[PDB]
Symmetry: C2
Subunit: 317 residues, 2 copies
């Protein structure tokens, strides 16, 4: 009954909540943590991932460091204004005693998937660079992955990096387009659904009074994330993007999915934009969406059930 998963992540405040939720999930085995840039640098993401393994007493869970820059190259623009200078808010934790594995995130991904064919589900919580590099290295990777659950994109909704683009896709558009076009069993969880799942002061404070294993830390890390949300929007609500993506992987019943070809804009002002062909209309001419195999896009979300699911995992002793 045990479900084998690999988490590709940039921790990251909301990533940390999802990683800890995965470690608390009963029928879930975290094969390893794959690190990437985004919320913080690849260096910081690796450190934070090692810290999480130590805190959760999951020292057996290996951490594989990935790409330091996107497919096109160049120093990435990290979201330190939303996640903190180190990517973990104001939470001052000492250096982890454990080390990263020698193999890259790409090599770890390729190896585990080929070892357990049709068994490994990949949860992509950050830019898709490592997954795209893994697809390019092994042609049987696409065939051997059970499913890829992607947190990214904005489908008929405003982006967070730019009005047109969501952060993860904006951080590496080329990689996102390569993954969405790969023909693998992909499930995309965009801002259109994650911005529906709100967390008020009530649930965050309910989490503090509980005897949750990592409750005190998660409330401490979410404190910085709350202050940014109130400054940027003027609302005392927070969207936990990564935990919603985890809920789509382990509890897909709480969501509704729509089939369609997704393409990513890699050029111009709308770089990082995710355009989905709804397939309801037959096009008069062949376009960049014709011929490619469709992927599943999260369309509807049972907001009260997802919030209660996240709360049940976080409050768990």
């Amino acid at each position: 009954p045990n479900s084998k998963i690999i988490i590709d992540t940039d921790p990251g405040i909301d990533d940390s909540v999802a990683i800890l939720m995965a470690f608390q999930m009963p029928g879930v085995q975290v094969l390893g943590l794959t690190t990437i840039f985004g919320n913080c640098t690849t260096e910081h993401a690796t450190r934070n991932a090692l810290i999480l393994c130590e805190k959760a007493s999951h020292l057996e869970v290996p951490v594989a460091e990935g790409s330091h820059e996107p497919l096109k190259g160049g120093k990435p623009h990290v979201a330190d204004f939303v996640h903190g200078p180190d990517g973990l808010g104001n939470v001052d934790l000492p250096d982890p005693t454990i080390k990263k594995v020698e193999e890259s995130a790409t090599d770890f991904l390729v190896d585990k998937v080929s070892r357990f064919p049709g068994e490994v589900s990949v949860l992509a919580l950050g830019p898709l660079t490592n997954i795209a590099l893994a697809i390019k290295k092994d042609p049987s990777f696409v065939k051997n992955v059970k499913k890829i659950v992607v947190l990214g994109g904005a489908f008929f909704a405003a982006g967070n990096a730019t009005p047109s683009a969501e952060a993860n896709i904006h951080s590496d558009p080329e990689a996102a387009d390569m993954v969405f076009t790969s023909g693998a069993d992909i499930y995309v969880v965009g801002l259109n659904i994650t911005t529906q799942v709100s967390f008020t002061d009530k649930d965050l404070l309910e989490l503090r009074n509980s005897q949750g294993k990592y409750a005190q830390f998660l409330c401490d890390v979410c404190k910085f994330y709350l202050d940014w949300h109130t400054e940027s929007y003027g609302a005392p609500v927070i969207f936990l993007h990564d935990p919603v993506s985890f809920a789509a992987l382990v509890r897909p019943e709480l969501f509704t999915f729509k089939k369609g070809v997704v393409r990513v804009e890699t050029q111009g002002i709308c770089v990082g934009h995710t355009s989905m062909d709804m397939l309801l209309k037959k096009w008069n001419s062949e376009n960049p969406w014709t011929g490619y195999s469709p992927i599943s896009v999260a369309w509807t979300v049972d907001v009260p059930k997802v919030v209660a699911f996240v709360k049940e995992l976080v409050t768990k002793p």
Copy 2:
């Protein structure tokens, strides 16, 4: 009380309904019809506009021919599959006896707006090429226009040219970006709202039994549009006209709109919702916001279109 308007159009089945509605609107004066490509070629659009003036007994309304291709150049892709080979369905009408004016659509636009400053409202029913050329020719055009009502874009909705783009914006993205960025008082009516306003067989057949001035012709022209299509039709242009004369039936949202001119998502309209303060300056920051149609009172708009078309 009379409202001075210029219609920039590519007639066009739905454009023809809106033009005839404007001619039937009480406190509305159509200063002229500005032609453009899109639903048909610029040549066909000009012919169809002249035919409409003749049918409506509005021979005093001048027709100024505009651009035959977009700002970037090249033969445009016309929607003859949706509007017919001539852009007026299967409605076989003889050549109009009246002719177009000597001045271009750009020169007509610039002249009428400078003559009546802060009085002329421009209804853009097709690609924005003529309006962008008018902005580039006269720097005081943006200041002198009362308002520009634009039919185009797809704001958090699927496009009709591509999944990302609406036809009018896709036909000339450079022009659309130049207009949305001009700083003029712009009102955008996208697919997000036009696909909400449905016209069934019931309303179309209700229109036939009425003693409407151009009812028989409008049902004949909409017959081809119905066959192309669910047994429902979206009358895009008439909704845009309703936003110009009856804005109360709509809700508008302020925001900076940018148009993608490059790549796969060419023609996409991205609106900065302004609800979030950006940490750094981006292509949506150094520009004045425009009004985007957000909500539409669907039953009131349908009843408004019906009252104008059934009018004797």
